Design a protein around this ligand. Structure first.
Ligand code: NAG
Lengths: 48, 41
């Protein structure tokens, strides 16, 4: 008898351009987002 | 203090040579074309 088993070893690695994802390259949006702290850098570091 | 922040503002470009202005000393004075050169603020 053959028992088949799948054990995953990877997931798809995703890096997100936080600035472009949130603001789409708009200066007003970037100025408004800067009030939220260092969100994009922390997101980049976490994903990396 | 002891923190790196991203700032958006009025800053010079990196490795910018800029414009150099040289002044001399004199009777009749010696000057360049600076007074007739109008730059853009
Ligand atoms: C001096 O500046 C004038 C403009 O004020 C310019 O037309 C002229 O060519 C300059 N002379 C130089 C760079 O020798």
């Amino acid at each position: 008898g053959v028992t088949q088993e799948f054990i995953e070893t990877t997931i798809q690695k995703i890096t997100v351009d936080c600035k472009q994802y949130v603001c789409n390259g708009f200066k007003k949006c970037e100025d408004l987002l800067k009030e939220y702290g260092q969100f994009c850098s922390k997101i980049n570091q976490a994903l990396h | 203090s002891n923190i790196s922040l991203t700032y958006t503002g009025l800053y010079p470009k990196a490795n910018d040579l800029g414009k150099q202005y040289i002044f001399s000393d004199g009777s009749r004075l010696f000057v360049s074309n600076y007074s007739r050169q109008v730059e853009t603020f």
